[PDB]
Design a protein around this ligand. Structure first.
Ligand SMILES: O=C(O)c1cc(O)c2c(c1)C(=O)c1cccc(O)c1C2=O
Ligand SMILES: [Mn+2]
Length: 201
């Protein structure tokens, strides 16, 4: 395997993509995309929003999952059907039939935007996989191992690609390299990524 515990499903979301993007726009109409500030004080180049019961966000100089969007003071929008159903099909195919995400982080990349190498290890149950769905322009995804200094590997993620990151891979350090400019007929000039998480207890 390229990554222990990971299941790559290329073009799995290709047919669903137009609906998924419509639903991204619907979510963003309620909880807008925003570029969050890191604890180090830097404005992220990736713009974000969330849907589901919980949303990943900065709050009081840390990160956490919150039921309320701090920008609107309202709940994050409910998980769209298209999101829920796509995630469940992917997770089930990959051997995680009980995966029940309560958070979906929606990342938007303009040309040049990047995501610095990091782990997601603050979720209560690290046995639950993350399901990652790529839409629009292609991006180079980098991933290493459980330690920051483990060797990095790189994989192009293209429109409609889904990866279910389970087992050990769930805790790999990962990031996205600066997005190359281009054109995609459904997203125009950007990439979106959905990451479904079980963030609740
Ligand atoms: O493409 C993106 O914007 C994007 C951003 C993320 O933060 C993650 C991913 C993609 C993953 O695919 C992923 C893989 C394995 C474990 C994880 O925690 C993550 C994520 O957190
Ligand atoms: Mn992450």
């Amino acid at each position: 395997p390229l990554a222990a515990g990971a299941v790559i499903l290329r073009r799995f979301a290709f047919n669903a993509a137009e609906q998924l993007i419509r639903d991204i726009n619907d979510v963003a109409s309620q909880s807008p995309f925003r570029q969050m500030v890191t604890p180090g004080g830097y404005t992220m180049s990736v713009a974000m929003t969330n849907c589901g019961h919980l949303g990943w966000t900065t709050h009081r100089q840390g990160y956490l999952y919150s039921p309320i969007d701090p920008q609107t003071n309202k709940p994050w929008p409910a998980m769209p059907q298209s999101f829920h159903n796509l995630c469940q099909r992917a997770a089930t195919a990959a051997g995680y039939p009980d995966f029940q995400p309560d958070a979906c982080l929606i990342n938007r990349y303009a040309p040049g935007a990047k995501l610095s190498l990091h782990q997601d290890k603050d979720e209560p149950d690290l046995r639950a996989p993350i399901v990652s769905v790529s839409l629009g322009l292609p991006a180079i995804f980098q991933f290493g191992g459980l330690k920051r200094n483990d060797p990095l590997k790189r994989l192009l993620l293209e429109h409609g690609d889904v990866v279910v990151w389970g087992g050990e891979s769930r805790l790999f350090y990962h990031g996205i390299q600066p997005l190359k400019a281009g054109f995609h007929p459904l997203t125009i000039d950007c990439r979106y990524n959905l990451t479904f998480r079980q963030a609740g207890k």
